[PDB]
PDB file of C-alpha atoms and ligand atoms in Angstrom:
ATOM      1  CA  UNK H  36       0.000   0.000   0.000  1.00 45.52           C
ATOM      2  CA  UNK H  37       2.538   2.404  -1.196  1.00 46.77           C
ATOM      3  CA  UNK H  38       2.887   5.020  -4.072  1.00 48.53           C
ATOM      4  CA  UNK H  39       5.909   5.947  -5.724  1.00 46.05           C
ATOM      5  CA  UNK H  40       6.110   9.858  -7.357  1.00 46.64           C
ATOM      6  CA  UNK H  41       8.970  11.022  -9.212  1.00 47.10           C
ATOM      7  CA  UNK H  42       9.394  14.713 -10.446  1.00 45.89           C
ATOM      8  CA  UNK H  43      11.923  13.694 -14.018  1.00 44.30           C
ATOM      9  CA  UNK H  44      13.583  16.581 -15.887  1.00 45.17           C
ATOM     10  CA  UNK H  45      12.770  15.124 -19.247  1.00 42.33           C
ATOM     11  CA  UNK H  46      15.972  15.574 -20.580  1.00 42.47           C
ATOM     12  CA  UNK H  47      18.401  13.402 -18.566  1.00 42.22           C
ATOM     13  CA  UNK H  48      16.235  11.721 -16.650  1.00 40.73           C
ATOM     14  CA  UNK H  49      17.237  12.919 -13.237  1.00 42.14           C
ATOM     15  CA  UNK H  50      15.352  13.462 -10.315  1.00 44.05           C
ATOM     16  CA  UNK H  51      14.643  17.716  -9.950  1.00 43.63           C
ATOM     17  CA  UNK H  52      13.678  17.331  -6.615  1.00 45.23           C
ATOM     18  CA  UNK H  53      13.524  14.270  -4.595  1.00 44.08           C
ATOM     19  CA  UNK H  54      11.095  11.226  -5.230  1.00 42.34           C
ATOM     20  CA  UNK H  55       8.273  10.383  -2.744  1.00 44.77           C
ATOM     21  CA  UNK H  56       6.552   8.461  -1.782  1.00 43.42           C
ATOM     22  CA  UNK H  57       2.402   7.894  -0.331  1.00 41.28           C
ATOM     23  CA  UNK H  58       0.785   5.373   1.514  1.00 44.09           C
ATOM     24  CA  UNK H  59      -2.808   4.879   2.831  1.00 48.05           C
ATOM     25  CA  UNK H  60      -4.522   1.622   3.865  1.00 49.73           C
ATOM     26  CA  UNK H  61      -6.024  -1.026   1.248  1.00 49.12           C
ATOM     27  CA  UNK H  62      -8.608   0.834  -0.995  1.00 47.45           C
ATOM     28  CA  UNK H  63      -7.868   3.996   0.282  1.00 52.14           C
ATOM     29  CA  UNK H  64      -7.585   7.353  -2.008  1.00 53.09           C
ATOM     30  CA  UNK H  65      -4.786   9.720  -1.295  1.00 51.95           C
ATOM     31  CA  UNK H  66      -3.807  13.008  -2.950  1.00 50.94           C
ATOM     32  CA  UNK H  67      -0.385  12.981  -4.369  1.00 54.01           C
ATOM     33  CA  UNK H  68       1.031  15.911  -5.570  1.00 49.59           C
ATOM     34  CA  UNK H  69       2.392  17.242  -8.958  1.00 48.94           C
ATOM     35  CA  UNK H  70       4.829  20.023  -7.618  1.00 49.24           C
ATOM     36  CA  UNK H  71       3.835  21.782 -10.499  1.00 46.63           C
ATOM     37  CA  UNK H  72       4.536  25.659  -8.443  1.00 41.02           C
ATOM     38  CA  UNK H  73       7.892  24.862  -7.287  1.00 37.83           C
ATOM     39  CA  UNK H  74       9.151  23.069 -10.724  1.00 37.47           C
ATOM     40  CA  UNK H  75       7.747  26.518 -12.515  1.00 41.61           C
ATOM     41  CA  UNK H  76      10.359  28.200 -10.708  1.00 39.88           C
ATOM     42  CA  UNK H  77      12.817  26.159 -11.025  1.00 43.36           C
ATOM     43  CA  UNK H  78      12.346  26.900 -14.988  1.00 41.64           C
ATOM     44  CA  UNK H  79      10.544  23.904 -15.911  1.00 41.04           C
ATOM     45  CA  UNK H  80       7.136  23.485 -17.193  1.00 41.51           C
ATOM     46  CA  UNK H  81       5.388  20.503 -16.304  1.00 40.99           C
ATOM     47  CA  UNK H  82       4.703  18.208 -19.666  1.00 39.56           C
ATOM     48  CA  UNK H  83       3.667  14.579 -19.132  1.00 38.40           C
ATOM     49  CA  UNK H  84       2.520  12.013 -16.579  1.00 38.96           C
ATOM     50  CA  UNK H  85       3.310   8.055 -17.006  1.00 39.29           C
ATOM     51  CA  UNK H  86       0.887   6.198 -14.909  1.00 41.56           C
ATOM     52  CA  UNK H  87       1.798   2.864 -16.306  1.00 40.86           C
ATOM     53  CA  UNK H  88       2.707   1.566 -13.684  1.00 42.51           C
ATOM     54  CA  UNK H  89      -0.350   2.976 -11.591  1.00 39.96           C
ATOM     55  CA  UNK H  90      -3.522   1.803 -12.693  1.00 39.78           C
ATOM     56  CA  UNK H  91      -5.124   3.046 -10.371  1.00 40.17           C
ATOM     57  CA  UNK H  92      -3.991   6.846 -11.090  1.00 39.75           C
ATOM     58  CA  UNK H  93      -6.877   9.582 -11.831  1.00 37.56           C
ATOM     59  CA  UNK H  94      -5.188  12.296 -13.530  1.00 38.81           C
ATOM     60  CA  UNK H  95      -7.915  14.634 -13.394  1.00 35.74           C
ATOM     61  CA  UNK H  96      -8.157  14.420  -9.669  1.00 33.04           C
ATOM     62  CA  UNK H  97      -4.185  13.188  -8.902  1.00 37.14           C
ATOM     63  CA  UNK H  98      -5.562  10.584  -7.175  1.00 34.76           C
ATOM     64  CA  UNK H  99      -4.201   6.994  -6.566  1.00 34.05           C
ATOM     65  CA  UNK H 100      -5.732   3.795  -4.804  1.00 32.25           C
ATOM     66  CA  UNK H 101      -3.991   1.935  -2.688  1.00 34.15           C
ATOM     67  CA  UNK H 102      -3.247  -1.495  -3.386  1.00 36.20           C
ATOM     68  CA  UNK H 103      -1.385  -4.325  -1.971  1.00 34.94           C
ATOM     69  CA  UNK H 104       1.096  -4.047  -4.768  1.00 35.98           C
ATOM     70  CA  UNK H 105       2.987  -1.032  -5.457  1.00 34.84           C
ATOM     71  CA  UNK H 106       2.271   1.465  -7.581  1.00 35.21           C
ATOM     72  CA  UNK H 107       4.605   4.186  -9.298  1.00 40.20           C
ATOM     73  CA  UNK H 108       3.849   7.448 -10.968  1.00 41.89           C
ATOM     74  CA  UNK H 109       6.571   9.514 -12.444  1.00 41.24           C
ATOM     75  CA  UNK H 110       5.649  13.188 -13.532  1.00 38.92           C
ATOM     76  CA  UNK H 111       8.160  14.965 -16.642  1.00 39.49           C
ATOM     77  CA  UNK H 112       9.158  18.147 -16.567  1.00 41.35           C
ATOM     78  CA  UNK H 113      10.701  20.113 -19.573  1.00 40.51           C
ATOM     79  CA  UNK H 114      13.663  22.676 -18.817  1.00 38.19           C
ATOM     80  CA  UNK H 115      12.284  25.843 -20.774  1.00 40.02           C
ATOM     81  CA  UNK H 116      14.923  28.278 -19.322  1.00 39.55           C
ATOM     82  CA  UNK H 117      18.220  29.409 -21.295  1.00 40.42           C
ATOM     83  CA  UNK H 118      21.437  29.586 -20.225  1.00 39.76           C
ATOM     84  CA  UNK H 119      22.549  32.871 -18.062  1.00 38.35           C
ATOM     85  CA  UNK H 120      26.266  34.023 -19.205  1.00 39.78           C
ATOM     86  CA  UNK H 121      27.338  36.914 -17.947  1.00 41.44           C
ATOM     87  CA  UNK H 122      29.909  38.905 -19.446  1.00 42.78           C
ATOM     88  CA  UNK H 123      31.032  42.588 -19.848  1.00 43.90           C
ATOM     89  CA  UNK H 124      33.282  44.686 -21.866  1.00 47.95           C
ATOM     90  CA  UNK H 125      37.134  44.095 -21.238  1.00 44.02           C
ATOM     91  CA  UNK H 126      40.031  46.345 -22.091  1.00 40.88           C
ATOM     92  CA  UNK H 127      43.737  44.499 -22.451  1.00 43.38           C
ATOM     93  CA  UNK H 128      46.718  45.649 -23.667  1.00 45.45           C
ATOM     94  CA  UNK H 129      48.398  45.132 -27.300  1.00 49.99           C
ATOM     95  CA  UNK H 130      51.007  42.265 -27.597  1.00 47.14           C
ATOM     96  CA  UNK H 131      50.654  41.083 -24.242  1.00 49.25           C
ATOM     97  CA  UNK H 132      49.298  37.577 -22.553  1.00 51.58           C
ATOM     98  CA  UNK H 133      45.967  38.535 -21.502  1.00 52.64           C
ATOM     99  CA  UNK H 134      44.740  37.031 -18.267  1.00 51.24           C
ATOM    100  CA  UNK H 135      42.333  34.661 -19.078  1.00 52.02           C
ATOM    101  CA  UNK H 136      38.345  36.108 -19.781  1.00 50.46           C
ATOM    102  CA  UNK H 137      36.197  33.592 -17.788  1.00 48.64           C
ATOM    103  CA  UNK H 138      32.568  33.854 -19.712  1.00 50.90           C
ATOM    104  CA  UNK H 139      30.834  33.070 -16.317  1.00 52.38           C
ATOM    105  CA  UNK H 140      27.841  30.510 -17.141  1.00 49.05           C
ATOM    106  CA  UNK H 141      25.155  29.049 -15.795  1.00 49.42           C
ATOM    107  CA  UNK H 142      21.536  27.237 -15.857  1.00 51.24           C
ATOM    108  CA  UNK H 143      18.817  26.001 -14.002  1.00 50.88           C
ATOM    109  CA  UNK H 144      18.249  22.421 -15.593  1.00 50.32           C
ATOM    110  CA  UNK H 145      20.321  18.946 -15.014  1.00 52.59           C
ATOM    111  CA  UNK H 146      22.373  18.693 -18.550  1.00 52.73           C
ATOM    112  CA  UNK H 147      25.145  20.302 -19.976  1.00 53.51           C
ATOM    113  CA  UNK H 148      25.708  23.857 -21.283  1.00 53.92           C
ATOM    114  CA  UNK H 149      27.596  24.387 -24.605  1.00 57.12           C
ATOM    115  CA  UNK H 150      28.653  27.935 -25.196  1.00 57.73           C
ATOM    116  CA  UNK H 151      29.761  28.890 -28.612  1.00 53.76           C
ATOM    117  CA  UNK H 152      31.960  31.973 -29.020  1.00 50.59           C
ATOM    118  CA  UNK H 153      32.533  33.764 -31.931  1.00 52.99           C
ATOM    119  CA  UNK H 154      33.936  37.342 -33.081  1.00 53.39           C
ATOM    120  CA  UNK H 155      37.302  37.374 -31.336  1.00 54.96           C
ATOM    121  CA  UNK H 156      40.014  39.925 -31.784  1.00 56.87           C
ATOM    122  CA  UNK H 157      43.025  38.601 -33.758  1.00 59.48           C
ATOM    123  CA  UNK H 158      45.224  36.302 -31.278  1.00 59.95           C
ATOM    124  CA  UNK H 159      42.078  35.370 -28.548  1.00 58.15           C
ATOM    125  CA  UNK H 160      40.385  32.377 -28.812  1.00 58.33           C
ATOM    126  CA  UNK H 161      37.665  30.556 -26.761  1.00 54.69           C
ATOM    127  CA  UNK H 162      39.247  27.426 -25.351  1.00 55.50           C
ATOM    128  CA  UNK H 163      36.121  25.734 -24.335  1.00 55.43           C
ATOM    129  CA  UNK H 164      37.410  23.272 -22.020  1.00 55.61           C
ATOM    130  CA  UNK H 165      38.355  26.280 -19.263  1.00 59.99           C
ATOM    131  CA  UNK H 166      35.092  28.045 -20.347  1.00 61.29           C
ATOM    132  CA  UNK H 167      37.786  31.174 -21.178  1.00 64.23           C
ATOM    133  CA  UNK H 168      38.769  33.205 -24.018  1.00 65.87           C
ATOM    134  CA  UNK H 169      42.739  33.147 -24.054  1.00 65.03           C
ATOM    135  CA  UNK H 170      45.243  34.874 -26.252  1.00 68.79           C
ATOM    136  CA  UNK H 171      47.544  37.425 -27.197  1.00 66.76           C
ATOM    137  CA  UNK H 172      45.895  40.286 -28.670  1.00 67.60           C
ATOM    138  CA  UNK H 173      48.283  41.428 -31.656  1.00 67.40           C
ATOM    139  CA  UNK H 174      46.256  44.715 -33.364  1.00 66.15           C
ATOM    140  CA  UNK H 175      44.659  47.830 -31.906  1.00 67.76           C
ATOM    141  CA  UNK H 176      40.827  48.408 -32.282  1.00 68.87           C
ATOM    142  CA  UNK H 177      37.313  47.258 -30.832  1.00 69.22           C
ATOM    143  CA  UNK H 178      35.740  43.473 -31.536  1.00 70.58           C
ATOM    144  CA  UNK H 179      31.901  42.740 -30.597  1.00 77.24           C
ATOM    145  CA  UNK H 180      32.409  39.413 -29.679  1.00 76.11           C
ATOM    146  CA  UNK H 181      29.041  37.073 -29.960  1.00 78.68           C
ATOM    147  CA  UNK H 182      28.362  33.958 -27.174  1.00 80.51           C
ATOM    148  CA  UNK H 183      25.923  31.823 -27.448  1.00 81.31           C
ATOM    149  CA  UNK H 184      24.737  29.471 -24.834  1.00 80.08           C
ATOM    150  CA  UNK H 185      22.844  26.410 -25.348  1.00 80.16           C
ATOM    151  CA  UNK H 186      21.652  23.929 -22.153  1.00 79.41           C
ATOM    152  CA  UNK H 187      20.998  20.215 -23.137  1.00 77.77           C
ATOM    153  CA  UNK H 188      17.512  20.719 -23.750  1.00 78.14           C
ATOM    154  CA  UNK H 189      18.584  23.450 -26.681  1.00 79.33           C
ATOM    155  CA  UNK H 190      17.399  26.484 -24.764  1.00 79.16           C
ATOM    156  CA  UNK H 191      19.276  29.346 -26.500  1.00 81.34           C
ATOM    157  CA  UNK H 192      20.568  32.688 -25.217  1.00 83.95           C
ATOM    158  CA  UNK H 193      22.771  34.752 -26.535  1.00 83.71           C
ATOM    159  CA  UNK H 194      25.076  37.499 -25.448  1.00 83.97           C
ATOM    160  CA  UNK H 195      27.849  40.218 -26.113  1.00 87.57           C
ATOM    161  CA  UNK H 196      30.276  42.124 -25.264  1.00 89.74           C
ATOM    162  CA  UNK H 197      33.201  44.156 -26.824  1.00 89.76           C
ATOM    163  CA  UNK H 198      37.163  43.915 -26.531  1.00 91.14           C
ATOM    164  CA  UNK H 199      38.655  46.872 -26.478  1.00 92.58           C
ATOM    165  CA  UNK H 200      42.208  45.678 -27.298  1.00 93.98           C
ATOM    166  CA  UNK H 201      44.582  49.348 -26.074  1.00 95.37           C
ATOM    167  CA  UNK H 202      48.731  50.300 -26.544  1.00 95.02           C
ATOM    168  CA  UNK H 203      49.981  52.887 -24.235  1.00 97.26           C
ATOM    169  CA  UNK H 204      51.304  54.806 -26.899  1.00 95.60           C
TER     170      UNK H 204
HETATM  171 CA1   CA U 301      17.928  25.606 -18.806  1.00 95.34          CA
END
C-alpha cells in the first residue's frame, strides 16, 4: 500500500527534486502531488505524466488507490529556461598575454551547457574546455564578440560584449 512519485527533468532523466513516496490503507484514495509551483520556478514546465505503472492513477483528480502491490507514478518536466552568461566589456593591452576572460555561465536544468563563441580579436580564442577566451591580442581596435549558450535541452541565449584591445602609446 505504497505510491511511488517522481518529479523527471525530461531531458536526462534525473530526479529535480527528490522522489516520494504515499501510503494509505487497502482501498484507500490519497492526494499525491504534482509540484507543479515549485518546478515553474525552477524553470521547468510541467509536460507529461506516465501512470503505467499505476492503474489506479486519476489524472484529473491526482488521485491513486492503494493497493497491496505497489504502484509508481513519475511526472516529466521540460527545462524551458536558457542559459545565463554573464559577461562585460574588457580592455587588455596590445602584444601582451591577456589574463584569461572567464565567460561566467550558468543554468537552471540537469544537462550540460555548450557555449559557442565567436567574433574574437586577432590572437584570442575561446578554449572551451576552461570556459575562457585566451590569447595574445596582436592589433589595436574594438571586436563585438558574440556567445551563445545552449543547455541540453537546446534552450538558447545569446550574449555580447566588446574587446577593447589598447597600446599605451
Ligand atoms: Ca535551462
Amino acid at each position: 500500500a505504497v505510491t511511488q512519485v517522481r518529479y523527471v527533468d525530461v531531458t536526462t532523466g534525473k530526479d529535480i527534486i527528490p522522489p516520494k513516496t504515499y501510503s494509505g490503507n487497502v482501498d484507500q484514495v490519497v492526494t499525491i502531488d504534482n509540484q507543479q509551483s515549485a518546478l515553474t520556478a525552477k524553470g521547468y514546465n510541467y509536460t507529461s505524466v506516465d501512470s503505467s505503472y499505476a492503474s489506479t492513477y486519476n489524472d484529473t483528480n491526482k488521485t491513486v488507490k492503494m493497493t497491496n502491490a505497489g504502484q509508481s507514478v513519475t511526472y516529466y518536466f521540460t527545462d524551458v529556461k536558457a542559459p545565463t552568461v554573464t559577461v562585460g566589456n574588457q580592455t587588455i593591452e596590445v602584444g601582451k598575454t591577456m589574463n584569461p576572460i572567464v565567460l561566467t555561465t550558468t543554468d537552471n536544468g540537469t544537462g550540460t551547457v555548450t557555449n559557442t563563441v565567436t567574433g574574437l580579436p586577432s590572437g584570442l580564442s575561446y578554449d572551451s574546455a576552461t570556459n575562457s577566451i585566451i590569447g595574445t591580442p596582436t592589433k589595436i581596435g574594438q571586436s563585438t564578440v558574440t556567445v551563445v549558450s545552449t543547455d541540453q535541452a537546446n534552450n538558447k541565449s545569446t550574449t555580447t560584449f566588446t574587446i577593447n584591445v589598447v597600446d599605451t602609446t
